[PDB]
Amino acid sequence: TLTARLYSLLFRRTSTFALTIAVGALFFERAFDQGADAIYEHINQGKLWKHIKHKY
Amino acid sequence: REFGHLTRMRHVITYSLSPFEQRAFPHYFTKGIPNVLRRTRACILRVAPPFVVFYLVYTWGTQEFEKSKRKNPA
Amino acid sequence: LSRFLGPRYRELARNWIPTASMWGAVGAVGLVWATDWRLILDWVPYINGKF
Amino acid sequence: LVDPLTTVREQCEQIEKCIKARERLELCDQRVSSRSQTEEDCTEELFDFLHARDHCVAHKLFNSL
Amino acid sequence: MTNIRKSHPLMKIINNAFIDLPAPSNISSWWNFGSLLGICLILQILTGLFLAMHYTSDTTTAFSSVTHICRDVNYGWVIRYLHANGASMFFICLFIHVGRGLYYGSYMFLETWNIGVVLLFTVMATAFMGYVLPWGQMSFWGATVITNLLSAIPYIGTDLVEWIWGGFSVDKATLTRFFAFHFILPFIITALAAVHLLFLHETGSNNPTGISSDMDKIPFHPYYTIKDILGALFMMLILLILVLFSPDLLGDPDNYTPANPLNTPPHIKPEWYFLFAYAILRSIPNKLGGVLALVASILILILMPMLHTSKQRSMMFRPLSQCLFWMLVADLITLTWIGGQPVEHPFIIIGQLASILYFLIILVLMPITSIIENNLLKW
Amino acid sequence: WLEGIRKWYYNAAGFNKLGLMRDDTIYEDDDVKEAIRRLPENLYNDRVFRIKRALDLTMRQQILPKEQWTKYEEDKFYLEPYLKEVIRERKEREEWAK
Amino acid sequence: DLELHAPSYPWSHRGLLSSLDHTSIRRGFQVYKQVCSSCHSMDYVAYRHLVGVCYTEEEAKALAEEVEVQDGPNEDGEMFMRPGKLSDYFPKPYPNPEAARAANNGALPPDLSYIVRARHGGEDYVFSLLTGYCEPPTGVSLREGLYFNPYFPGQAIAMAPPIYNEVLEFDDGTPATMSQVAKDVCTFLRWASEPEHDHRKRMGLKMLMMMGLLLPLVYAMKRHKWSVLKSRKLAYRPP
Amino acid sequence: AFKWRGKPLFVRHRTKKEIDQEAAVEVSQLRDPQHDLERVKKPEWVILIGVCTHL
Ligand code: HEC
Ligand code: HEM
Ligand code: HEM
After folding, report:
1. Distance between CA D64 and CA G95 in Å, rounded?
2. Angle at CA C6, nearest 5°, toward C5 and C8?
3. Which positions in this protein are listed as binding [2Fe-2S] cluster 2 (chain H) (predicted)?
């Protein structure tokens, strides 16, 4: 199973657990920030400063 | 109060299972919804009436303020 | 509560009234001295000159 | 320049609630006017009309703006 | 040779106070509020400090400094509104905690109950002095009214009021001393909370059933750490919703006006969590009687362990007592709403009836009803 | 008749729904622990198991099936004779004190 | 007595995750520049806050350079004029607060840095109050120099009617109809009261997603650890 | 008026005309349940604070 391989490759050791958490947070911060910012800009398209900097 | 001199028991057996063997959501909706409905049925006839009479009092006072506030023909 | 009162408690009260009254006098004197309570201090002879 | 606010007022004064508020308003108007020495003010019925009209106006207007 | 967790002195105290503490197995979600308040307390302190580093407690600059915090300090607005709405959440959790204690017969713990009453009084004082600091119209005039309340006390009266004021009325000196008292008090609250926990631990905790749970105690760490963490996450959800979606939901707009002593705002109401007292204030025509009723409303919690007559500790098996308690809660919301509203004919009579009912339920209805229940249950 | 009202209150209290009995829910005041201590072994064991089961049920927010509810006529006041003696002894000590 | 509460207008930012229409913010700043700043004052916000919100850096510095601002002591202690910079707060039309009352009938124009967040009702009030002027009803005479406005408490404002159609010319070229001017200036005032509005909504979106992620997982962890106790089966075997 | 405690002090000498007019003023018609001599104890010296009630 994929989950079993993930466990007894990268979850058994608590120190490996911490390393996994650290790298996962490193990537998750970027992914979540990008996604949330894209969604928020999509909702208010044309109503933010970044959408009207080109005009002026 | 630490473990060891809490109380005295005899002939009590407790069977239990590992958290890694059970499902953390065993029949979450199949059994949970009937239990919540039963609890609501047991409690509502005692909890609701004071709040509903509070709502009646609030609405009555809020409407009472305006007509005392309203113009008196004279 | 009604569990109190009766024979034994009344002479306890009588025995401790002198001490309790003396403690109340202690509190009264300490209060009037601490805040410099004028109303009383225009009557005691030597301290009248404080004001 | 034709202000969209004025046109919204015009079409939104047709709502039958506005109709009753307005007719009550003149029913205050002639009563106060004819009565020389009276302290009554038609601000009450005027406020009723203003509320009834402005809720409707708030529903409209911003679409045109 | 021995585990550090239960051999090191500080570690031993932490272990037998938060890790290996035997707690009842069936404590409901309401008990979680005990943790939340403490967390709120930390959230009140840790955020509050960061406001003290850009707030100048001077009449000429207090409001301007707060506006500077919210408009120019990097992420300052988050700190300010987090603090305000967290104080509101603190009072919400405090009221729910008192309700839990009253409901499930917890006031048999006596010492913990009295320490809790003292903590409650200190928290209300802290919030009162806190509201003044922004030096808005409502802040200034609410401080004026609440301090002028103390003029009702006989003899000393005006002298005590001006002593608090540091002058003839509220002014720069009053603002400064309010800021200093506000800074010091929460640490006293923290020490008192430590004493509260110390007193509580000697006897354990009251489970919802009210029976002794010495036969079902479980270690605290595996279960209640994560349970209270879930509770704190829920409280953070509510608090963050309040801060980031309706920051001024529980807040008068007029506090965003610089305090002008020459204009009385049309409405003078305290914070939302004081209205239940203030409404009682409005109920009693006599000023001295009003102040005595205001203090007695909160002081009545001390009488509760003496006013309990039912042979059942909890309220879980007592229906009529449950109905009475929920009527009491509804009366509390009624008092809050009445205090919110001004003082006219529709509200005066309602306030009088609400105050009378609030005292009557605690002092009369609840004990007599407990007697009725004991008689009805063959004991 | 009054017994109908007593039955109604017994059903409304709900401690029977947990399998408990009347004396299993009494608040443990200073007299109550002494009364419990004097209980015979079998009654004490049954009481402690019943209370443990009640706590188990309340942790899961569940009740016993309708069949296993302590009916009002089957409820026994096992503690009552001991509690009466403890209270009488306390009253006698108080009377000698005054 | 009586007061008329403002109707709940459908503002662009009324939405739970909506943002101020920054083009309308720019137009509202124009309105404040050539209408409200003449007698009304705004202090807590400065030209610096304009960048990245409604004006670019060049436009903001030009706007600051247009006005004249008093500075500190001269080489001999004089009060020399100076072209305003980006770090300058919006000039106050009247030097002392009493001079504002003296120039007017006697009521000082409140500062707009918080008027949206200080008046009960919000923009709906400030908008409607501008677009709510009407002839007084019969039977209520107003003093000379006073004006009747239903939404203003007391129904007696000291404003000359500030906003009327074709008062100013927007740089964009949108029609200058009175309703448009009022809406744009109201949006600008909302921005003035809450500059962090858009950022607050963005962080609120992030918080909503983060909690919708965390709460199920933490609840699952709680269920996992508590499942030892929620599945225990007791047994009693007395001899 | 002088300027004490952050408020002006509207003080008039209340010439005989003013005090007789005030005495002629009915207490009931006034919203505030107050009488002229009851508020100010000097008919020819009225001492009133500055500002105005109601903003
Ligand atoms: C132009 C775009 C505007 C806007 C948005 C506002 N004003 Fe004025 N204002 C003036 C005076 C003398 C007063 C005092 C009247 C009183 O409050 O009693 C005001 C008041 C306001 C308010 C406060 C209303 C409230 O609810 O208290 C608001 C929100 C307001 N103004 C907005 C005078 C002038 C004036 C020339 C004398 C001009 C031009 C403006 N105002 C313009 C505006
Ligand atoms: C017991 C917990 C606390 C409560 C209930 C509390 C309550 C309050 C309240 C209601 C306000 C007004 C907020 C506003 O109107 O915007 C406030 C402001 C303030 N508090 Fe606290 N506070 C607490 C703890 C602290 C602590 C520990 C400090 C010091 C570190 C502190 C410092 C301040 C400061 C400086 C302000 C002014 C900032 C502002 O304008 O909001 N507070 N507090
Ligand atoms: C400063 C705010 C307070 C804090 C931080 C605090 C802290 C705590 C904590 C952590 C608990 C254990 C968790 C729990 O049992 O719920 C607790 C229990 C208790 N508190 Fe408080 N408390 C506060 C206010 C109060 C108040 C106002 C009262 C009532 C007067 C009170 C009375 C109690 C009682 C009776 C208990 C025991 C409840 C039980 O275990 O059954 N506390 N307190």
Report:
1. 41
2. 100
3. 52, 54-55
Number of alpha carbons in the 13 Å side-chain half-sphere of residue F32: 12
Which atom in ligand 2 lies closest to the alpha carbon of residue E136? 15
Within 8 A by CB and 6+ apart from G129, the residues are G6, G149, G151, G152, G157
**Pairing mode of beta strands H2-4, G233-236:** unpaired
E6 catalytic per annotation: no
Residue B37 to residue B44: CA distance in whole angstroms: 10
Residue G17 and residue G204 in contact, taking contact as beta carbons nearer than 8 Å: yes
Cβ <8 Å between B35 and F61: yes
E271 given a catalytic annotation? yes
B12 pairs with which residues across the strands? Answer: G236
In b/e form, how buried is each residue of E336-372, taking b as 16+ CB within 10 angstroms?
bbbbebeeeebbeebbbebbebbbebbeebbeebbee
Q: For the purposes of burial, counting CB atoms within 10 Å of the CB of F37, is it exposed (0-12), middle (13-18) or buried (19 or more)?
A: exposed
Considering only CB atoms, which residues of chain G are within 8 Å of chain F?
A: 229-230, 232, 234, 236, 238
Rounded to whole angstroms, the Cα distance separating E235 from A40 reads 25
Contact E264 H7 (CB under 8 A): no
Q: Which residue from E232, E251, E371, E240 is spatially nearest to E312, judged by alpha carbons?
A: E371
What is the phi/psi pair of residue E179, to 5°?
-60, -45
Which residue, by CA, sits nearest to atom 28 of ligand 3? E116
Ligand 2 center from residue E88 Cα (angstroms): 11
From the number of C-beta atoms within 10 Å of its C-beta (0-12, 13-18, 19+), residue E331 rates as: buried
What distance in Å separates the CA atoms of residue B63 and residue B57, rounded to the nearest whole number? 10
Q: Are E328 and E361 in contact (CB under 8 A)?
A: yes
Token pair belonging to G54: 């409604």
E252 assigned to active site: no
If residue D31 lies in a helix (H) or strand (E), which one and from where to where? Answer: helix D16-34
Amino acid at F8: W
Q: Give the 3-state secondary structure of residue E80.
A: helix
Resolution of the structure, angstroms: 3.5
Nearest residue of E to residue F14, measured between CA atoms:
E317
Contacts of B49 in chain E (CB under 8 A): 323, 326
Cα gap G154→G148, rounded to integer Å: 9
Structure tokens at H28: 């009931």
- Paired tokens of E74: 């990097």
Query: Which residue in E103, E119, E109 sits closest to E199, CA to CA?
Result: E109
Which residues, in sequence order, are CB contacts of E189 under 8 Å at separation 6+?
A: E41, E119, E122, E123, E126
Instruction: Tell me the C-alpha distance between F31 and F90, whole Å.
Output: 8
Contact call for residues G61 and G86 (beta carbons, < 8 A): yes
* 3 state DSSP class of H2: strand
**Nearest CA among E117, E87, E89 for reference residue E101:** E117
Neighbours of chain H (3+ CB pairs under 8 A): E
Interface test with E, best of F15, F16, F21, F69 (most E CBs within 10 A): F15
Cα torsion for G163, G166, G167, G171, to the nearest 10°? 110
The answer, yes or no, to whether any atom of ligand 1 lies below 6 A from the CB of G36, is yes
Tell me which method was used to determine the 3D structure: cryo-EM
SS3 E307: helix
| Beta carbons of E70 and E77 less than 8 angstroms apart | yes
